[PDB]
RNA sequence: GGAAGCUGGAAGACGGAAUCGUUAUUAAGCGCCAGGUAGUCCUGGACACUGAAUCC
RNA sequence: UUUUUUUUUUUUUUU
RNA sequence: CGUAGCUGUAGAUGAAUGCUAAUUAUAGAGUAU
RNA sequence: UUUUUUUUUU
């Protein structure tokens, strides 16, 4: 559940998966399916929806209606059942890597808190220093940073288990 | 033209012309 | 190894048996055209030409057999065979 | 996405006529000389009636028909594969019309005299 | 409601919408409106500027029956599809008799039966009775009490050709039959003048005697004197012979007498003339690759004649194509039947109108949080076109 | 020798073991022709687009 | 452009 | 220009493309099943 | 992945 299969003959996208407001929620480009993320245990997993095409003439809503519509109805249905049973909410106890978050290593040849990211094909580098803010707070700087511009171009990225 | 990319390149590029030729296999 | 083509040569036998009938319209797909591909020399191409003459829908779905419409048939595809 | 034409809608086979509204592309061509071969004949007036068998319609339609139409048809498309770039092939209906003009074959649609031209 | 009145949504009871539409909702409404959570919830529709245009020609016309008033129909070209989820409501409301059919199509690519016939018209056994099983429905009460003439009981085919057309079909044959025993008369220079005109007095006599006893048309025997126009129930009995020849004449019988107004309202008209999915021996070389055009077979073909509005004098038709079924391209509107003088061409919602959309999906509980200082940022991205703002919004958080 | 129609029951879902190395418009995919003085390659030369990740 | 359109993008050039 | 976006089919347990009575093109000559 | 036209339908 939690592998990113790469087609071969497929389009490249630059965001494959857009976060959403919603902490429970995903959209996928890639299979132009809806997903939702929940921490379970231990591990990231993920229910999938359908957005293929194949009944009452009546109101076109529900049943057997191949409608790209039909996976948005289908998730908001489902999160409410989350919370007002209150199955699985809790906080996600497993960890990402030994650097915190991911994305984040710490450098080698001297003391510093590296925080790589790409935006619009660019990136940037140095980021906030260590020694001179210590091992406390510039290692709280250094998160703060990917949290807060993933929350502007709605970039999802996946947790791995190790 | 032996291989599959440059042989199926042939039947697109007369597609592009205003001619029909199969696809399906190859 | 080499007992299985005289294994899978019963399989072309069995054809044999299942022939002296104008056409097997039992299938397996719900198809017309795509049943009608399961016999010998017929394909996608020669599939499709037997049903022009049927005057029918692509995807129709296999009508009751009768015997008047077994004629029909039958007839169309020697036509087709021929090339 | 996969259109027929290209992106300008590319119509490199088909040929218009002056009178009347109907096109057909060239493949069709062949086999309408063929089976008007009994006006054609008689228009300008053994050796010179070969191909009189041919005017059979069910023949056409035989095993033996298909590659007759087939060996006259070389589909000008293909050619040699060192034709690339600015060296691609033209519409090959110049050629066409000529004959089909010259010939005085007369239309499906309604019976006139030469009007066919390219486009 | 008028002028001052623009752009805004109109609430609409759910249970009253379905009895009023009992087909289906207008247009691809249906996908937006199973997006809302709440069950009870009402449904709105804009109301656009192109339909105050509209609205105001009817009113007129209604009045005038009691040449001003416009004698045809119109087009919608370019939301063409949205207006048509608020002009059929209001009309039938008002004691019009209004045919509706939003997927003309259905009866096209689906599974049916087809049978040659020397007319050179297809039939549809099958698709022909659902077509007025849907339309009695909700017009049901008001095709009994309407009386029927005399004066067009019984002038049509089995497949709905006219005996005048119908019976063309079979001259060449009869031109042969006669030339063959003209011998007789033929073999008994007297003037050479009168000879000549004598023998081809002859012709005429036979040709008028031949044309009345070898054609037998149906003259809907069944029903000798009928009574009303609703009450032929034997159609909807037998299927395999009257199925095409009943749903013809009620076609010709509304166009004669006038006693209600009528409304006809085909959508999506740009998918009958491209070839249907149905396959046959009938191709001009490689025209269709074996295919039956869609124009020519029966169903589609009723609906795929504008130029015969002018024989509606109890209302008109009217047409609209917004979806990408097909590229528009071109589309020359001259050569087929509408003038240039009724396109309707309607253009993306203004500004002041896309406010309003977003604030509507507000009150449904749709989106999450759509801050107004991104109210005018999604603008430029969607261009303010329905199709792009409604997915881009639904996709993400909106806002 | 190249390509195409028709026909189609040639041998393959084995192995998460192991050997060839990439210093980011790198890697992975896809598309085009210039020369080889008639045609005549899955290699070599040469241009362009999508373009992720890691402790190197 | 409210009688205007009816639409994907390349490897030399408006000196 | 290709994988486009978009949009119909079967949300393939069955998409492997070689074998050949038979023709398309270059060349003086590439033929026989 | 495929559009009508030179006229004979109340």
Redesign the interface.
């Given at each position: 559940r939690q592998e990113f299969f790469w087609p071969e003959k497929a389009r490249r996208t630059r965001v494959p998966l857009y976060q959403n407001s919603r902490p429970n929620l995903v959209y996928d480009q890639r299979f132009r399916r809806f997903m939702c993320m929940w921490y379970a245990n231990g591990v990231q997993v993920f229910r999938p929806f359908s957005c293929r095409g194949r009944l009452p003439d009546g109101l076109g809503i529900g049943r057997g209606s191949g409608t790209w519509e039909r996976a948005r109805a289908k998730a908001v249905v489902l999160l409410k059942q989350l919370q007002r049973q209150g199955h699985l909410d809790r906080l996600a106890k497993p960890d990402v890597t030994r650097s915190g978050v991911r994305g984040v290593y710490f450098d080698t040849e001297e003391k510093l808190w590296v925080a790589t990211w790409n935006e619009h094909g660019l990136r940037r580098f140095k980021a906030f220093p260590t020694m001179e803010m210590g091992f406390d707070a510039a290692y709280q700087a250094a998160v703060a940073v990917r949290r807060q511009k993933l929350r502007e171009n709605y970039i999802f990225s996946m947790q791995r288990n190790r | 033209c032996m291989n599959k990319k440059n042989r199926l390149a042939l039947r697109k590029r007369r597609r592009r012309m205003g001619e029909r030729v199969s696809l399906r296999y190859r | 190894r080499q007992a299985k083509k005289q294994t899978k040569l019963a399989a072309k036998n069995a054809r044999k048996m299942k022939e002296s009938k104008g056409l097997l319209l039992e299938g397996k797909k719900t198809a017309l055209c795509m049943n009608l591909m399961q016999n010998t020399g017929i394909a996608?191409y020669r599939s499709?030409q037997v049903?022009?003459?049927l005057?029918?829908?692509?995807?129709?779905?296999v009508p009751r057999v009768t015997a008047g419409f077994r004629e029909k048939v039958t007839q169309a595809v020697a036509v087709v065979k021929?090339? | 996405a996969r259109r027929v034409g290209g992106i300008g809608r590319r119509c490199f086979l088909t040929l218009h006529c002056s009178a009347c509204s109907f096109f057909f592309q060239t493949s069709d061509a062949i086999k309408l000389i063929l089976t008007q071969q009994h006006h054609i004949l008689r228009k300008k007036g053994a050796s010179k009636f070969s191909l009189l068998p041919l005017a059979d319609a069910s023949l056409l339609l035989k095993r033996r028909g298909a590659l007759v139409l087939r060996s006259l048809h070389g589909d000008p498309l293909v050619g040699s594969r060192r034709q690339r770039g600015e060296f691609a092939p033209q519409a090959p209906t110049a050629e066409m019309a000529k004959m089909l003009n010259k010939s005085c074959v007369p239309c499906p649609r309604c019976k006139r005299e030469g009007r066919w031209e390219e486009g | 409601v008028g002028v001052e009145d623009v752009g805004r949504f109109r609430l609409f009871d759910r249970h009253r919408l379905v009895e009023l539409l009992p087909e289906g909702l207008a247009g691809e409404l249906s996908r937006d409106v199973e997006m809302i959570p709440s069950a009870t919830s009402p449904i709105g529709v804009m109301l656009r500027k192109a339909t105050l245009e509209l609205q105001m020609q009817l009113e007129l016309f209604a009045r005038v029956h009691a040449l001003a008033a416009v004698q045809r129909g119109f087009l919608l070209d370019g939301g063409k599809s949205c207006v048509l989820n608020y002009l059929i409501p209001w009309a039938r409301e008002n004691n019009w008799l209004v045919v509706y059919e939003p997927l003309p199509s259905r009866y096209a690519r689906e599974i049916g039966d087809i049978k040659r016939s020397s007319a050179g018209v297809y039939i549809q056994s099958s698709f022909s009775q659902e077509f007025l099983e849907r339309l009695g429905r909700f017009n049901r009460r008001l095709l009994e009490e309407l009386p029927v003439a005399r004066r067009c009981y019984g002038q049509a085919a089995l497949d709905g050709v006219h005996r005048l057309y119908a019976e063309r079909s079979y001259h060449s044959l009869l031109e042969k039959a006669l030339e063959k025993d003209l011998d007789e008369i033929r073999e008994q220079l007297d003037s050479q003048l009168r000879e000549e005109i004598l023998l081809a007095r002859e012709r005429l006599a036979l040709w008028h005697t031949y044309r009345r006893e070898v054609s037998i048309p149906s003259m809907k025997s069944r029903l000798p004197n009928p009574a009303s126009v609703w009450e032929i129930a034997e159609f909807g009995l037998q299927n395999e012979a009257f199925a095409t020849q009943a749903l013809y004449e009620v076609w010709e019988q509304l166009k004669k007498q006038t006693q209600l107004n009528v409304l006809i309202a085909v959508d999506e008209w740009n998918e009958c003339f491209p070839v249907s999915e149905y396959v046959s021996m009938r191709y001009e070389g490689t025209r269709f690759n074996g295919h039956i055009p869609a124009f020519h077979l029966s169903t589609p073909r009723l609906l795929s004649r504008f130029d015969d509005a002018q024989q509606f004098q109890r209302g008109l038709k009217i047409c609209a194509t917004s979806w990408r079924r097909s590229n528009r391209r071109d589309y020359r509107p001259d050569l087929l039947g509408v003038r240039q003088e009724e396109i309707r061409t309607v253009r993306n919602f203004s500004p002041l109108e896309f406010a309003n959309f977003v604030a509507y999906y507000h009150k449904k509980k749709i989106l999450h949080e759509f801050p107004r200082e991104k109210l005018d940022y999604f603008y430029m991205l969607s261009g303010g076109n329905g199709f792009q703002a409604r997915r881009l919004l639904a996709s993400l958080y909106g806002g």
């Amino acid at each position: 559940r939690q592998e990113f299969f790469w087609p071969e003959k497929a389009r490249r996208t630059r965001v494959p998966l857009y976060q959403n407001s919603r902490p429970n929620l995903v959209y996928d480009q890639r299979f132009r399916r809806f997903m939702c993320m929940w921490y379970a245990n231990g591990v990231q997993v993920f229910r999938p929806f359908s957005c293929r095409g194949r009944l009452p003439d009546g109101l076109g809503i529900g049943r057997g209606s191949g409608t790209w519509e039909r996976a948005r109805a289908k998730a908001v249905v489902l999160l409410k059942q989350l919370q007002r049973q209150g199955h699985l909410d809790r906080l996600a106890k497993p960890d990402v890597t030994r650097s915190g978050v991911r994305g984040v290593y710490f450098d080698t040849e001297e003391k510093l808190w590296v925080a790589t990211w790409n935006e619009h094909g660019l990136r940037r580098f140095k980021a906030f220093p260590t020694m001179e803010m210590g091992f406390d707070a510039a290692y709280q700087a250094a998160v703060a940073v990917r949290r807060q511009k993933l929350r502007e171009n709605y970039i999802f990225s996946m947790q791995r288990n190790r | 033209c032996m291989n599959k990319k440059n042989r199926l390149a042939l039947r697109k590029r007369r597609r592009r012309m205003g001619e029909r030729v199969s696809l399906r296999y190859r | 190894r080499q007992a299985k083509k005289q294994t899978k040569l019963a399989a072309k036998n069995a054809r044999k048996m299942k022939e002296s009938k104008g056409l097997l319209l039992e299938g397996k797909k719900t198809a017309l055209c795509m049943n009608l591909m399961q016999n010998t020399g017929i394909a996608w191409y020669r599939s499709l030409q037997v049903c022009k003459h049927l005057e029918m829908h692509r995807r129709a779905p296999v009508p009751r057999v009768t015997a008047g419409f077994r004629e029909k048939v039958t007839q169309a595809v020697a036509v087709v065979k021929l090339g | 996405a996969r259109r027929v034409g290209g992106i300008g809608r590319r119509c490199f086979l088909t040929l218009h006529c002056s009178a009347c509204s109907f096109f057909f592309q060239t493949s069709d061509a062949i086999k309408l000389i063929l089976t008007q071969q009994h006006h054609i004949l008689r228009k300008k007036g053994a050796s010179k009636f070969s191909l009189l068998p041919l005017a059979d319609a069910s023949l056409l339609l035989k095993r033996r028909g298909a590659l007759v139409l087939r060996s006259l048809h070389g589909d000008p498309l293909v050619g040699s594969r060192r034709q690339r770039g600015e060296f691609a092939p033209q519409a090959p209906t110049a050629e066409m019309a000529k004959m089909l003009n010259k010939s005085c074959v007369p239309c499906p649609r309604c019976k006139r005299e030469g009007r066919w031209e390219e486009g | 409601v008028g002028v001052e009145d623009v752009g805004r949504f109109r609430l609409f009871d759910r249970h009253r919408l379905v009895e009023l539409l009992p087909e289906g909702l207008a247009g691809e409404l249906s996908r937006d409106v199973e997006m809302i959570p709440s069950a009870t919830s009402p449904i709105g529709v804009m109301l656009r500027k192109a339909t105050l245009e509209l609205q105001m020609q009817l009113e007129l016309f209604a009045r005038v029956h009691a040449l001003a008033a416009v004698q045809r129909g119109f087009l919608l070209d370019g939301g063409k599809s949205c207006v048509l989820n608020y002009l059929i409501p209001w009309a039938r409301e008002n004691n019009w008799l209004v045919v509706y059919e939003p997927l003309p199509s259905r009866y096209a690519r689906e599974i049916g039966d087809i049978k040659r016939s020397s007319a050179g018209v297809y039939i549809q056994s099958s698709f022909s009775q659902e077509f007025l099983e849907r339309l009695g429905r909700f017009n049901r009460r008001l095709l009994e009490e309407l009386p029927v003439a005399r004066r067009c009981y019984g002038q049509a085919a089995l497949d709905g050709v006219h005996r005048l057309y119908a019976e063309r079909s079979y001259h060449s044959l009869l031109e042969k039959a006669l030339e063959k025993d003209l011998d007789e008369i033929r073999e008994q220079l007297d003037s050479q003048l009168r000879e000549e005109i004598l023998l081809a007095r002859e012709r005429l006599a036979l040709w008028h005697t031949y044309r009345r006893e070898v054609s037998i048309p149906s003259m809907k025997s069944r029903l000798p004197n009928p009574a009303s126009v609703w009450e032929i129930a034997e159609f909807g009995l037998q299927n395999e012979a009257f199925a095409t020849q009943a749903l013809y004449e009620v076609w010709e019988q509304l166009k004669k007498q006038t006693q209600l107004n009528v409304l006809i309202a085909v959508d999506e008209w740009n998918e009958c003339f491209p070839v249907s999915e149905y396959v046959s021996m009938r191709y001009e070389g490689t025209r269709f690759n074996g295919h039956i055009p869609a124009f020519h077979l029966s169903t589609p073909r009723l609906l795929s004649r504008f130029d015969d509005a002018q024989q509606f004098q109890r209302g008109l038709k009217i047409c609209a194509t917004s979806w990408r079924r097909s590229n528009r391209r071109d589309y020359r509107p001259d050569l087929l039947g509408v003038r240039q003088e009724e396109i309707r061409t309607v253009r993306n919602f203004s500004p002041l109108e896309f406010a309003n959309f977003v604030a509507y999906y507000h009150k449904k509980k749709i989106l999450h949080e759509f801050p107004r200082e991104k109210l005018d940022y999604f603008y430029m991205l969607s261009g303010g076109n329905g199709f792009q703002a409604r997915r881009l919004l639904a996709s993400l958080y909106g806002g």
